[PDB]
Amino acid sequence: MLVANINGGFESTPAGVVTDLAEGVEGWDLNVGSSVTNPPVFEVLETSDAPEGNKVLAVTVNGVGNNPFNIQATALPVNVRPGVTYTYTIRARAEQDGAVVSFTVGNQSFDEYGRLHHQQITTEWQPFTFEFTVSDQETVIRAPIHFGYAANVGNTIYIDGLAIVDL
C-alpha cells in the first residue's frame, strides 16, 4: 500500500504508555493542553484484536480542557501533492458507550482541508472515512484527531489503521 502518513497503525512503536508526546510515536504528534487538569493516558497496546498489525493507540480521557483540540493525536508528517484528492480511513472504538471524536486534516498553517465532525464511537471497531483535496500548494500536511470532548471523560478511545491514500 501507498499511504501518505507514517506508522498509521502504531506498529513501529514499542508497547507502553507514551510520555514523550511530541516524539515518542513515530509519525504522530500527541498534545495535551494545560487546561486539562486530570491528564489523559496515551498507550500503545499490543492486543490480539488490533484491526491492523498487533498494536493500537489507546487514549484514556480522565478529564478535558476548554476545547476539543486540547487532547489530540496528530499524524505528521503527511506527504501529499497539491491539488490531489485523498481518501482518509481510520478504525476506532471505545471502552464504553458514549464517545465522540473528530477526525481532521489540515496544513502546517492549521488551515483545515476537511473533517469528520463529532463522530459517534461505539464499543465495536468501525471504519471512519472521508475524502479531502489539497486545495493549496502544500506538500507536508497533518491529520489532527480531537479527543477532548466532555462526553469522553471516563472512557478510553482506541484508534488504529490510519491510511491516507491517493484517491
Ligand X SMILES: OC[C@H]1O[C@@H](O[C@H]2[C@H](O)[C@@H](O)[C@H](O[C@H]3[C@H](O)[C@@H](O)[C@H](O)O[C@@H]3CO)O[C@@H]2CO)[C@H](O)[C@@H](O)[C@@H]1O
| Residues contributing to the annotated binding site for Ca(2+) | 9, 11, 52, 55, 160
Of residues 17 through 36, those in contact with Ca ion by CB under 5 A are 23, 29
Give the residue numbers of the binding site. Answer: 9, 11, 52, 55, 160
Q: How far apart are CA 154 and CA 163, in angstroms?
A: 28
**112 is in the binding site of which of Ca ion, ligand X, none (Cβ under 5 to 8 A by kind)?**
ligand X
What is the DSSP code string of 82-117?
TT-EEEEEEEEEESSS-EEEEEEEE-TT--EEEEEE
Q: Which three cell numbers stand for residue 9?
A: 497503525
Query: Is 138 near Ca ion (CB under 5 A)?
Result: no
* Among 102, 127, 126, 99, CA closest to 115: 102
93 binds Ca ion (CB under 5 A): no
Q: Minimum CB separation from Ca ion for residue 26, in Å?
A: 7
- Closest by alpha carbon to 76, among 112, 22, 117? 22
Is the CB of 37 or the CB of 110 nearer to ligand X? Answer: 110
For binding to ligand X (CB under 6 A), which residues are involved? 29, 31, 69, 72, 74, 76, 104, 106, 110, 112, 142, 144
The least distance separating Ca ion from the CB of residue 124, rounded to whole angstroms, comes to 17
